[PDB]
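Tokens for TccC3. Go.
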Amino acid sequence: TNLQKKSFTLYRADNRSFEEMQSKFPEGFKAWTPLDTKMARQFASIFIGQKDTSNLPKETVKNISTWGAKPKLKDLSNYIKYTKDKSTVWVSTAINTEAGGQSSGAPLHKIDMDLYEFAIDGQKLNPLPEGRTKNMVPSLLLDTPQIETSSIIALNHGPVNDAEISFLTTIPLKNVKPHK
């Protein structure tokens, strides 16, 4: 296996002005119900056998607890796949401008990061040098090799090139780059 940062170029389909992102959202992209760096690691920690989902939205923990005591990427992948509502907490992006879901020409934003591709096996965090996902095994994207040490956490699930990267963290305003 290889612990290596993969260069992810994600596209957030959501109407926002770039200067507005500079002014109104100087920290980063905010979801309807946004979560802090801490809450991100509190979220993803569940997959490796942690239940420190404190302060996280009741709607989110509702789903988290109903996955059982052994949640995997697939469980959250399902949650995110079937849920695009307000109480989502995540910022859904795509590794292409296709799966972004542009609401009538909704401006795409180029998120540019270098994230580790991980998978959960027996509640262990293992890197995925082989691919981006394996059918029922989505990838956990971390900026730092360990969940509780990472400031950027995202749940990536898709096909090979149509991967949907759902950030479980406020996307840093340093990683947002202009798009057409």
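The chain has one domain: 5-177.
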